[PDB]
Subunit: 360 residues, 4 copies
């Protein structure tokens, strides 16, 4: 299936080989996608359109922390482990992105997983799991306990590097973005900072925005698309989570700066951060790592005022965020869920047509 | 039993009638205390010394929000719902204080609790439960699922106004503070705010500090207390946190409540601790008069100027004093406990405490 | 003179009558523009291309505070009085926007201005002047004391409602934005919340961005424009200050939210916030006013979860910011300054031709 | 003159040799103290009781930045260069502490000083002077231009290592703390983490707090001290107006350490200052601008070069961090008391008189409490 560039959408910058967050070496991504039931929703009975996406910054067997920093665009949502990130500039264990109704279950499941996977002496370090959410309330039985501990273990255990599945998968399964089908998107940039190449990888769980605000490559596209409006039975709280990985050896305060750039990439695509739209970004470094109870490893150190290096990284965040958002839309297929609510994937043919008209 | 004042510990300011957070009208507190098993710990089998404490800002039947603001002393811990507080200056639903291992269970149970009670069209507002933790790792089987959904429902449904149980109860059950038994403490102040009085109520879940730093009424007391050192199976032995909840009936805006929360640190400072590297120390303040009807117009009965020192300083002083006293009240309320692996932590000795206070304050 | 709309640039939303920050009733703006000297720069002798811009939130005679909140995109710059805003949610007195070298002079001049102007009993309230800066280092003798107390007094006293002069004036005099001439820009939006209308006014002092990132109405325009690159002798640190005024009766924490929306408007126009780019936003309400030592006046109260109202206001900030930035570019004319550095105003004829091609 | 310890005030921890911020090697401190005029205040004519205190983190000739992080207890006040610190975790140039009325003058004067001392090609780095204030409004003609550029230059140029003058000097000259004479105080702690020793030095400009809240060594001492209330024209300030605690207070805390800390770790250091302040009883008034800035002298960033981080500390290394944190709390606590002891009775503008906390009484109280 084509991704955004393939359909003729131009973006600046050079992607990594996978054009995904896994272009940052050692990052692993796993999804569990829960799709079951059809028709009228009854709380506790589905239909279910939900899941969880796991990102292991250093791979699933790592006990070490990664340097990290975050930013908030609009904080009407949940992302656990963030007080820790703010305070000590690192987090341990994986990042879970899921649906709002699943947060508690995923949080406890991550602890349980640690008990069976992590040495008991290290369990102490597994007590502040990182779990974030967007709300799949149109397509999913949010309160209905559709996600199980086993689903979470499967995502934790199944995570891998290499190409990342996008669209209606994992935490993104039941999401809606720009009034089209929401979901998971990812992109990366390889940036040149003088004599060194660094990678910036971004994965988004997109559940935000309005059709009439959407811009793709600067084109206000909602009015240009014909049909594809959501339906109920056949008749015609937002959020966005942004995860940024880099192999640049950044300190925590520098990673906050990286996270703060995501908003500019979001800005490019037209949304204005709704009052109840939980829009968050978290950035981590895979080269600035903190062995559990050990000496932090900082291979090289970058000056914040080194604009050559920092600007290349910041530009990478903005570009990869912009593209990750479009990649999501293009990856996400039309879906009918709870109460026969139907949300369309942004139509490829119309998008390709629009890009040709605008960028011969 | 005696609280700190009853042992002759002096504090400044005028407490409310209950000297508890429930002196703020309409606030309800519930505990579920889970104490079971003895001897060697096996994960999933206890012993359990844990629980959950529930605070309903406007009572358990309220669907409305309260204006709120928070502060971090040291952020190595979890407190959910706080991004919401930072952003829109309010939170819906109860505050849950619990042990670290219980956070996810309590979070999901709070959502479940709303289901069937709250109108389906209002369920959306129940999706960001406020849950905070400290770690009961020495006395409790943290990962062992000792806390059940039913325990959480019981605290949510059982909460009430009036006197608040302190000590080894609810979320404070298995906690350790200043190397003595930790737990729940509470206090209040009625403050004279210019031409009006307001109540500031504070509840703490204390799992922080070192005996050698502890000051009570300014007295460095660790060295004055004889014995009472923690034991491992009856032999003297060779991650902390502190949660502070501030309620006030002052009609404060969210940014003003952040200021209130930031005062908690000064009260903590009076008692001598220095906020350890891994010590998750947080404060959350809410107003019970600045309320936000679900999907309606905020109700702000009166408005206060941040530069009104007469009014703000009285409230700020209230936070400091009530925090300071709530911490000492916790110590006094918490009794010696033996828990997992026969780990034993002593309640600060009342007889010794009284003797010291009498000696220092004739 | 033509503004961006007059050149055929499309924008969304409805501007107020003046399409300026002064569409918010009672707000006054004054500029002092200091242009003297030519040729080689010698510190203390010019040439000078600098100035100061004053914004009186409630007019120059007011001793009252306005509810306020700020946001930081990238904090490598100065903006005084902001600790006060963060703490008590208000500031007293005018906003001054100026060149980096003038901050201290402007700061003390604002205090001086209050002396005699303000009853001695109220002088306490004048001790935390709000002064912000961008760096006019290429066109101006920054350290050369080109701005005088008299210049500052003139701006304070000469400030007025009505049309706001844009371009190479006041604090924007010697600025450079997107590798074109920088300066002052302004725009406004009248926003609808049910039946209630509010105005959101924005004024920018723009000294940020690269030509190759610039996007006007989504068009990446730097590559489409021919010539107009900066020169020195005829041979071919940034910042952006955003001031947001609204007559919505917002509380301070809500105004922080408004300020955080500015970054999204900046994002639309393509920049990525350089490592040394001081990019800040300050938002204030002219209806939520705090009489000195009195009761705050809050005529109405808005629920943060009132999407209808808040989103209208948010959309307004984003739109007015986007347009203020383009208005700045269009209003700023080519200038030669210190060391014969020459910076071109973005070419009107080319911009119009490009906009006509893109938006028939 | 005696400092707090010499009056029998006990403190925990081990001070550096100087028990001052200059126990952190290379830190230099300079004061310019402006005291002139007596009697009725006329704006523009004095009397003046003001000044400026300069702290050069790496010495007056350094062009390099220090890693830094800040904390706000109550933000009703000014401290410039702090957006820079929050964003990039360092600041260049000196810290200046002064009276509120002098902020702009000092800010511009520091730039002017740079023009003199700094290579033209490095001037770009001197654009965000760090200037902080407390308000000397009871003893000083705040708006009256008492401070001159020459005063600032003298503090900048005169700054040095070694013993740091405390009390009514530099920025502290006209200040009032706990209803006694305010001013400059300093202390340090040498802390142990394994075989590693670090120094934490603290300097404060104190203009905060009320006598009724003051605790020294945990003793609530305001009621134990007899007399020494502030006076105006020869009588004790009393009545529904003149008899209430001062507002428009402030406290500036500067923390230096030679521990190689990253900026976010220095923010944590700065947040510890509040606990030290708390020990001494104050509750941060609504208009009390109370701020802390912490910097490292070992984690330095040469201008345009690579940051130098000679060692690295894990935030979760409780042994190391807790020693440093405890160091900040203790040094802050002691600096505040050292300030009170160093500041002598002063009469200033409008014949306002503020007493230094009485040494004889303090010593007697301490001797009774700690026999």
């Amino acid at each position: 299936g084509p991704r955004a560039r393939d359909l003729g959408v131009p973006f600046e910058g050079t992607p990594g080989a996978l054009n995904a967050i896994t272009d940052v070496a050692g990052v692993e991504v796993g999804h569990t996608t829960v799709i079951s039931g059809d028709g009228a929703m009854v709380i506790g009975k589905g239909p279910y359109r939900t899941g969880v996406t796991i990102i292991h910054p250093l791979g699933k067997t790592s006990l070490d922390g990664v340097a990290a920093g975050r930013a908030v665009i609009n904080g009407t949502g949940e992302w656990t482990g963030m007080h820790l990130v703010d305070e000590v500039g690192q987090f341990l264990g994986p990042i879970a992105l899921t649906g709002t109704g699943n947060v508690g279950l995923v949080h406890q499941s991550m602890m349980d997983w640690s008990v069976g996977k992590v040495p008991e002496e290290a369990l102490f370090s597994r007590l502040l799991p990182v779990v974030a959410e967007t709300l799949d309330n149109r397509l999913n039985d949010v309160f209905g306990h559709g996600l199980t501990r086993d689903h979470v273990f499967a995502a934790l255990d199944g995570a891998k590097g290499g190409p990342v599945a996008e669209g209606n998968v994992g935490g993104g399964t039941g999401m809606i973005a720009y009034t089209f089908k929401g979901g998971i998107g990812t992109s990366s940039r390889v940036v040149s900072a003088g004599d060194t190449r660094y990678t910036v990888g971004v994965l988004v769980q997109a559940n935000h925005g309005d059709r009439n605000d959407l811009r793709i490559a600067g084109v206000q596209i909602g009015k240009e698309i014909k049909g594809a409006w959501p339906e109920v039975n056949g008749i015609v709280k937002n959020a966005l989570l942004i995860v940024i990985a880099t192999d640049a050896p950044l300190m925590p305060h520098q990673l906050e700066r990286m996270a703060r750039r995501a908003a500019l990439g979001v800005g490019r695509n037209g949304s204005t951060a709704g009052a109840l739209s939980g829009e968050f970004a978290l950035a981590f470094s895979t080269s600035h790592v903190i062995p559990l109870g050990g000496k932090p490893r900082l291979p090289a150190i970058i000056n914040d005022t080194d604009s050559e290096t920092m600007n290349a990284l910041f530009r990478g965040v903005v570009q990869a965020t912009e593209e990750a958002l479009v990649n999501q839309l293009v990856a996400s297929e039309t879906m009918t869920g709870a109460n026969n609510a139907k949300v369309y994937g942004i139509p490829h043919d119309q998008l390709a047509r629009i890009m040709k008209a605008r960028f011969p």
